């Protein structure tokens, strides 16, 4: 097929993924001399650190979904291409991509391969069609529709069983992205949603937080695992520990604890945030170069992030198993920018005769807990709590993308924290059912 | 079936919808010693009349649908209740609604019914596959995905014929919600995509207006129709009346004009908002009673907006066909006002002997046409142009809810006028296809 895009006599670069790492790639290129082909998945870069304000009402997508296509505008090397990355050929030097049903063979001379990696339901995939994973905008919408729209049910129903059902809102996984969802959830429930309803109170609705790790927050070591999790318990989000789920059902998760005992929590909302499994990518070149993948098929790439024998093909931030470096934000970052000042140090005049490995330079980690709380550690440096969380506040309002962009969060934050008011508690049917009733009818269409 | 709702010993209100008909009666009932039930397809009060600045990127969407149990928080004696009703019993005096497979049957002793009116395809609504008509946030979100969808497959497609179908924006109707669609369709083409592609240029896209009336805006008078056309004209806007639509296809249009020649608008990305037809349920009132519809089915209405018959059940806002009173926001709110205000009359024995006819207080009316355009008649005088434009925007702020919500409308204004970025051009795949992609494996799956 065709290649789907302008080309170019110049050494031709093509990124694979509008994220941290695909952006930043691009953007250490905008001098570089190279024709730069950035091929995505969806049209915007999300920052995915606040993915959990827009699933629980807080901010608007186009506070953390710019168009990728604007953010490069004035880069004249750069092209942004939609598109699904459906093969990539290593041999031919193509990637194949898919948008509508019409099919495109990008050519390259070097290849950066940031498509990141989602969360994993250990292989019981079945799962998804009854606990999302938030991962995009689509999956946020669908965790609001789901959460806000369990209140809605409840205030219907005469059985009190299936309101108790109903008012049993269960996360799972304690790993930042759980404990922000069951933090932001029990807010809503005892704060936000406070005295709008008349038949159900919100405030009796029960937040259970599972992991089967024996800690909450691993990442963080002991001392600030256990203050966020006293914090969630003070909030009376019931955190239980070394709970492995075993069995999912639209009415609920059936657990095995950690002595053996199995028993069952009767749940409506389930949000799915364990685990992690790179891009499908992986396989496709495992398979074709060699190189092998850890369990969650992340790319355990070359100390330069190349793949064996493809020194111009690099894997970056979370689909990539570099040794030591954590699937954070400025992993992605830091691996873009190093593979992409690779690739202008290499195709300008200069030559290294050999590559420096990466260095991934560790700038520290945070989880926000709750409003007002938070934990952060920084090298030697471990705290907590109100300071900790206007850290965390700042530090991610300085990656979000235009003034305008920032006023705006800053008010709605501004006013769901001092204020309990939420902006973005719109809800659709479509929003919160659309991926399960097609998977469904395409379920049944495969007959 | 039970009732989904709380019991009361006082005298029962139930209100069909939550836009301005059905939350103006509720709000209007916050003192009468009434129960009131809000029963409504959606959790939020969309404010329509800025639905296009969500379908083309400007505001996010709750900037414009609050939540309604929200607003009436404090109303201890208002239950928002979420429920599609399917059927209205005149005779038991009950509403039978459905939410997510569960069948509630609410009594009432006074129905105001406020269920409005959608867009008309007139014969031939198997259009609606092709041409979507933007009247909810899925819809507004719909039309956004296909519009910034179809600039993203043009920069792909190496066939200039399917360029040009792509990048050729339909529009159908040349009321109020066409104008400004086919005006913000041509800004966006020319001012805040431009530049921002590599293959194609936007400002080379071609925007249709097609409408069979003879004129623009046919509500305004010819005087301010022609100069909304003039001003369409020159924003580049092809407009087209006399045309009448005879097909419509994935790839085009099929037209038949006032010459009586047929020719075809190949064009990718449709917007129906010609005609209107009242909410289906006025054939389940037309049935149990002897009211009239109208060919749009709206229903005739006695002077009091009562059903023949049925002196406690009104119709009000675009669903009812009062004489004289048009299909506007004001309509919506004073037929409301007006039935609650004779419930709170009659329920506290203050009743009079006869009641006076329902009078509709003509406001006046204003259409936005563009950036700094837009036309404005108010009884005697007519005008134009920016000051209408202005007088436009400071009317339809008013109507906003909450305060942070007008800041941040104002500022997603003060940057979409004064600059031109848009913060909401966020699309997903998933919002531009589900709703086509749903009916057609339910097509499939009715074999
Ligand atoms: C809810 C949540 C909260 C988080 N909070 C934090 C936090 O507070 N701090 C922190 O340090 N980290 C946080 N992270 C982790 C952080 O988001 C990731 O480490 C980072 O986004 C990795 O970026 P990436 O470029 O590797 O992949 P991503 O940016 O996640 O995705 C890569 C891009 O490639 C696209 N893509 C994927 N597959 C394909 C394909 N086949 N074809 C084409 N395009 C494709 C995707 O659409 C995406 O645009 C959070 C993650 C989540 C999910
Ligand atoms: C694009 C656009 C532009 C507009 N521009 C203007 C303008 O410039 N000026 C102006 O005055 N007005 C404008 N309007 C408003 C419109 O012309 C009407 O005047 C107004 O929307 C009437 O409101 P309503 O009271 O009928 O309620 P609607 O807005 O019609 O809302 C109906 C409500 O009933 C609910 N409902 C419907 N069917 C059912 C059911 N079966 N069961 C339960 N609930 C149901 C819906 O979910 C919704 O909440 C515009 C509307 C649109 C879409």
Redesign the interface.
């Known amino acids: 097929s065709?290649p789907?895009?302008?080309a170019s006599d110049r050494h031709k670069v093509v990124i694979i993924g509008s994220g941290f790492g695909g952006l930043t790639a691009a953007k250490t290129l905008k001098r570089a001399d190279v024709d730069v082909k950035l091929i995505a998945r969806?049209?915007?870069h999300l920052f995915q650190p606040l993915l959990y304000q827009v699933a629980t009402?807080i901010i608007?997508?186009?506070?953390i979904?710019?168009?990728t296509?604007?953010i490069l505008?004035?880069q004249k090397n750069a092209?942004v291409?939609?598109?699904d990355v459906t093969h990539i050929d290593l041999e031919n030097k193509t990637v194949d991509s898919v948008?509508?049903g019409?099919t495109?063979s990008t050519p390259y001379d070097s290849l950066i391969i940031a498509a990141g990696a989602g969360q994993s339901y250990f292989g019981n995939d079945h799962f998804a069609e009854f606990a999302p994973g938030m991962k995009?905008?689509?999956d946020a919408l669908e965790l609001r529709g789901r959460i806000?729209?369990a209140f809605?049910?409840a205030?219907?129903?005469?059985d009190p069983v299936r309101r108790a059902k109903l008012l049993t809102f269960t996360v799972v996984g304690a790993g930042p992205t759980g404990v922000e969802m069951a933090g932001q959830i029990a807010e809503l429930a005892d704060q936000t949603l406070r005295?709008?309803?008349?038949?159900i109170d919100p405030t009796e609705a029960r937040v259970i937080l599972l992991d089967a790790a024996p800690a909450v927050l691993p990442p963080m070591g002991e001392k600030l695992g256990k203050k966020a999790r006293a914090r969630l318990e003070k909030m009376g989000v019931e955190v239980q520990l070394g709970a492995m789920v075993t069995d999912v059902d639209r009415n609920g998760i059936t657990v095995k604890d950690s002595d053996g005992t199995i028993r069952r929590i009767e749940s409506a909302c389930k949000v799915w945030s364990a685990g992690v499994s790179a891009s499908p990518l992986g396989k496709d070149l495992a398979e074709q170069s060699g190189v092998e993948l850890d369990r969650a098929g992340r790319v355990k790439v070359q100390p330069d992030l190349t793949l064996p024998g493809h020194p111009n093909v690099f894997v970056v931030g979370d689909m990539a198993a570099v040794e030591g470096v954590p699937g954070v934000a400025q992993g992605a970052i830091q691996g873009g920018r190093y593979a992409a000042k690779i690739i202008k140090r290499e195709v300008s005049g200069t030559s290294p005769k050999i590559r420096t490995p990466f260095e991934y330079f560790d700038k520290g980690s945070m989880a926000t807990v709750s409003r007002f709380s938070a934990v952060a550690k920084v090298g030697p440096v471990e705290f907590a709590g109100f300071f900790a969380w206007l850290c965390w506040l700042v530090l991610h309002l300085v990656y979000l993308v235009?003034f305008?962009?920032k006023?705006?969060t800053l008010?709605?934050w501004g006013?769901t924290f001092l204020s309990t008011?939420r902006?973005?508690?719109?809800?659709?049917?479509?929003?919160a059912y659309?991926?399960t009733?097609?998977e469904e009818?395409?379920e049944?269409?495969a007959a």
Chains 1, 2 share one sequence.
Request: proline share 1%; glycine share 12%.
């Open positions: 065709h789907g895009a302008t969806t049209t915007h009402g608007s997508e186009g506070e979904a710019p168009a296509r604007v505008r004035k092209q291409l939609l598109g948008l509508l019409h495109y995009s905008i689509d806000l729209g809605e049910q205030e219907r129903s005469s005295g709008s309803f008349r038949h235009g305008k962009t006023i705006v008010l709605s006013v008011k902006g973005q508690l719109t809800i659709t049917e479509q929003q659309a991926r009733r097609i009818l395409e049944i269409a």
